[PDB]
Amino acid sequence: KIFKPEELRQALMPTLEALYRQDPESLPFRQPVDPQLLGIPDYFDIVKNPMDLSTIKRKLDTGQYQEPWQYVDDVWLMFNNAWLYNRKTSRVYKFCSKLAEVFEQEIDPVMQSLG
Ligand SMILES: CCOc1ccc(C(C)=O)cc1-c1cc(NC(=O)c2ccco2)cc(-c2c(C)on(C)c2=O)c1
């Protein structure tokens, strides 16, 4: 179907806020990765399509998504980037896995209610 921006925002924002409420696990993901500020200069050699919570939130707030799977795609892109770049034993990788667990619990009833 065709989705109105306000409809997508009201339905999907709670799933995004569930990620933000994870503390400390959302902290690596709330703003875009700046490899200079973080001291990880090889980041963009590995992560070619960056994504983060602030970008997703702004896109959802300002109507940049036409349909809900575009939002889901961006969330998983953020997770996949972090699992690709960070080592399996690293703190940031483990934090990512926690966010993905939360997202999987929240997203399916919302997607079913949408469409
Ligand atoms: C270099 C190691 O950091 C990273 C490496 C890789 C990635 C990714 C997303 O692949 C992200 C980080 C990372 C981590 C944290 N915090 C913690 O790990 C933490 C908090 C408490 C305990 O541990 C904050 C920020 C951060 C940002 C993005 O914007 N601001 C502002 C920030 O502070 C970035």
Write phi, then psi, for 38 (nearest 5 degrees).
Answer: -90, -15
CATH code, 29? 1.20.920.10
| Residue 26 beta carbon below 6 angstroms from any ligand 1 atom | no
| Residue 71 beta carbon below 6 angstroms from any ligand 1 atom | no
> If DSSP states are collapsed to H, E and C, what string results for 22-74?
CCCCCHHHCCCCCHHHHCCCCHHHHCCCCCCHHHHHHHHHCCCCCCHHHHHHH
Experimental approach was X-ray
**Structural tokens at position 26:** 């959302």
State the distance from the centre of ligand 1 to the C-alpha of 30, rounded, in angstroms. 9
Q: Is the peptide bond before 24 cis (omega within 30 degrees of 0)?
A: yes
| CB neighbours of residue 60 within 10 Å | 23
Q: How many domains does the chain have?
A: 1
- The residue among 11, 28, 17, 38 whose CA lies nearest residue 83 is 28
Q: What is the resolution of this structure in A?
A: 1.4
Long-range contacts, 55-64 (Cβ 8 Å, 24+):
56/16, 57/16, 60/8, 60/9, 60/12, 60/13, 60/16, 61/9, 62/5, 63/5, 63/8, 63/9
**Structural tokens at position 111:** 């997607």
| Residue 38 beta carbon below 6 angstroms from any ligand 1 atom | yes
Kindly report the length of the chain: 115
